[PDB]
Structure 1
Amino acid sequence: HMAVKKIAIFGATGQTGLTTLAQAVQAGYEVTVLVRDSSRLPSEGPRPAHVVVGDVLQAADVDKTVAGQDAVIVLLGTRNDLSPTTVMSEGARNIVAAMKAHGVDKVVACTSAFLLWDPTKVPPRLQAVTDDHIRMHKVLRESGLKYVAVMPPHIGDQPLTGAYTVTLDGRGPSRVISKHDLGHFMLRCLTTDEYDGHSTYPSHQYQ
């Protein structure tokens, strides 16, 4: 019945991206992914409708990915690399410009629950990556787009439940969210305007 039907997913080959992609395909979305390496997509796994091979640091590649979409999901990250980086904030800059040029309004983007923390209490080893989450959140907040700021705590390997808590504009009662539940939530944000302009912290107790 397709109010939102065509979506771009950035970071679809990552931990959360892969299950977000699987869930999106099963839910009937027509998914376009931007991937650096097509081999990162599972050969047996569910196939997106459209693959763009390129880099989020090329405006041209982002433009090709955002063209014609109804909404954008952002799950960019640096895997376990804790080095100083601007890939997420610069990627978000390109995504914002592409959305504005192509008339896409809705962006659901994952940073981190550390953006709800006292900034001085972030573990030093995570500060470089958190610094770029901060830069990225500022890019998206200042864009004027309909931006849902997803700020998860630890991403785990527990099941899909669809039963997690969503805390608005503050830290939630648990310190973990499964990658499957986080992906479920990213997609849920496509079906409602209630989180637009808010920060959201999904979390759950797996039992």
Structure 2
Amino acid sequence: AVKKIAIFGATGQTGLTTLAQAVQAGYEVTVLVRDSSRLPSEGPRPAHVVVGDVLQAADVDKTVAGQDAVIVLLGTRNDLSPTTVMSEGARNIVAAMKAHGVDKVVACTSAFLLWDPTKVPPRLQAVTDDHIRMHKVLRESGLKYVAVMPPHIGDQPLTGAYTVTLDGRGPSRVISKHDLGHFMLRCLTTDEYDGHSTYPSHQY
């Protein structure tokens, strides 16, 4: 079974609850954070903290070393400018996983990768472009890759009752951040989603 995991993006909206749920479930969690000040000071906390940047290959390498699996929840917070942080970060993660023999990566992009490209809101296209680039890096890596492609991420409660749609869009346009984190961790316990795109959604 999967015991040691690295989480990238652990200080973000979904990352923080994914981190808390992972520790609750008994995982030995390692995180790469740009600033440990953005990690919780009480409650569930990671077993190992690396402070550094996903754009520094040395920082990614020491985060991935020794893990059983990797969770990717990188993002740009509210910045919708053009970016390559997620795809370049993914390149470094793939290289580190290959060097260290880690084969399982669960990575969040967006449901827009499942949309008709004429329907993607132009204001979100620059971020979506790098989600596309990141997905390409991960799909071409040959690793056991679960492509998590959520719709809008909300702040509704944890339910564990969401629908998981494979290789297409699902019947709701929202997933709570807690349920998205729950699903990321579920993907560590099964291989049934490897090589698929997954769309978690629910009605709250």
Deviation at 1:46, TM superposition (A): 1.7
**Cα drift, residue 121 of structure 1:** 1.1
CA deviation digits over 1:12-68, x for unaligned, max 9?
Answer: 000000000000000000000000000000112321000000000000000000000
Separation of aligned partners in 2, 1:18 and 1:46: 10
Which runs of 5 or more residues in structure 2 are unaligned? none
Task: Work out whether 1:185 is the aligned partner of 2:183.
Answer: yes
Q: How far does residue 144 in structure 1 lie from its aligned partner after superposition?
A: 0.2
Secondary structure of the corresponding residue to residue 187 of structure 2: helix
SS in 2 for 1:8: strand
Matched with 2:25 is 27
Moved more, 26-35 or 116-125: 116-125
Q: Distance in 2 between matches of 1:114 and 1:154?
A: 10
* CA–CA distance in structure 1, aligned partners of residues 33 and 198 of structure 2: 26
For residues 167 and 144 of structure 1, the distance between their equivalents in structure 2, rounded to whole angstroms, comes to 23
The CA distance in 2 between the partners of 1:187 and 1:33, in whole Å, is 15
- The 1-side partners of 2:24 and 2:98 are apart by 29
Partner of 1:162: 160
Distance in 1, Cα, partners of 2:56 & 2:39: 20
**Per-residue displacement from partner, 1:126-166 (whole Å, max 9, x unpaired)?**
00000000000000000000000000000000010000000
The separation in 2 between residues aligned to 1:195 and 1:97, in whole angstroms, is 22
Stretches (4+) displaced over 3 A: none
Find the residue that maps to 2:200 and give its secondary structure: strand
Q: 2:124 aligns with which of 123, 126, 151?
A: 126
Question: Aligned-pair distance for 1:178?
Answer: 0.2
Q: CA deviation at 1:100?
A: 0.3
Matched position secondary structure for 1:191: coil
Question: 114-123 or 129-138, which moves further after superposition?
Answer: 114-123
| Counterpart position of 2:170 | 172
Q: Distance in 1 between matches of 2:48 and 2:139?
A: 28
Any unmatched runs of 5+ in structure 1?
none
Give the superposition deviation at 1:119: 1.3
User: What CA deviation, in whole Å up to 9, does each residue of 1:98-137 have, x standing for no partner?
Assistant: 0000000000000000000011211010000000000000
Mapped partners of 1:90, 1:71: distance in 2: 19
3-state secondary structure, aligned to 1:177 = strand
Secondary structure class of the residue paired with 1:202: strand
Counterpart Cα distance in 1 of 2:59 and 2:169:
35
Looking at structure 2, the residues matched to 117 and 136 of structure 1 have their Cα atoms a distance apart, in angstroms, of: 17
Task: Tell me the secondary structure at the aligned position of residue 81 of structure 1.
Answer: coil
5 Å matches for 1:100-139?
Answer: 100-139=98-137
User: 2:145 aligns to what SS in structure 1?
Assistant: strand
When the two structures are superposed, what TM-score results if normalisation uses the length of structure 1? 0.98
Q: Once the two structures are aligned, what percentage of the paired residues are identical? A: 100
